[PDB]
């Protein structure tokens, strides 16, 4: 097994948008420059989260077979996968120890941002755990697209036209788990485990938004939208 010429473009067509757009230095630079207060921390995290929802719409914008789906379906998808994609994007940073990530300081602002404790633990655990998989950019990009195009989402209409888009990507991930990882079969099944864990965080998150909302904590118009009424 290797990769048919049809699946050889799914890896490129996807791995392109994944590098085509990154986060502005003016923003990610604040993690370091700015002060370290519970407000300034929370404010900066809000900024990234908001700026990231754009990259998402852009990245998810392309995705072949996407603009074909019903408009009342692309929304459900972007809304149900917003937080999971975001969570998977941050995991890459803390794990890839990217320079523009400032993970050492980032982890600071995160821990001190009004975030409850119950949800601060699982969060990093997922990070250390997923981290151990030594995933490759190709695994991140495909897994993300897989997350975004998840039929099982809520308020969906044509749940059958989604599986016809995710299944192809899912098939291209396994092939890689047989090509770049033969020594261990379970790899693919290791990565799919991350789909259920990410989902666990959506649940934790809906709650950590409430704690925030009651504390006079507001979010941008864009995030309010994607996460429903703030």
């Amino acid at each position: 097994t290797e990769l048919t010429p049809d699946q050889q473009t799914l890896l490129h067509f996807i791995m392109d948008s994944y590098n085509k757009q990154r986060m502005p230095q003016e923003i990610t630079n604040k993690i370091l420059k700015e002060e370290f207060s519970a407000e300034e921390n929370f404010l900066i995290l809000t900024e990234m989260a908001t700026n990231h929802v754009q990259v998402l719409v852009e990245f998810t914008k392309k995705l072949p077979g996407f603009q074909t789906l019903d408009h009342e379906d692309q929304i459900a998808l972007l809304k149900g996968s917003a937080v999971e994609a975001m969570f998977l994007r941050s995991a890459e940073i803390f794990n890839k120890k990217l320079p523009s990530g400032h993970s050492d300081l980032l982890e600071e602002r995160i821990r001190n941002s009004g975030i409850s404790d119950e949800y601060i633990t699982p969060m990093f655990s997922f990070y250390k755990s997923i981290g151990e998989l030594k995933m490759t950019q190709e695994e991140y990009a495909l897994l993300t697209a897989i997350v975004i195009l998840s039929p099982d989402r809520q308020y969906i209409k044509d749940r059958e036209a989604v599986e016809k888009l995710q299944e192809p990507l899912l098939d291209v991930l396994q092939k890689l788990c047989k090509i770049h990882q033969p020594e261990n079969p379970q790899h693919f099944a290791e990565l799919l485990g991350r789909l259920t864990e990410l989902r666990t965080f959506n649940h934790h998150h809906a709650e950590m938004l409430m704690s925030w909302r009651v504390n006079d904590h507001k979010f941008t118009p864009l995030l309010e939208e994607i996460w429903d009424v703030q």
Partner: peptide, 11 residues
């Protein structure tokens, strides 16, 4: 309800 996201998907 979807004004901002719909807009972003039509740019």
């Amino acid at each position: 309800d979807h004004q901002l996201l719909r807009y972003l998907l039509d740019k």
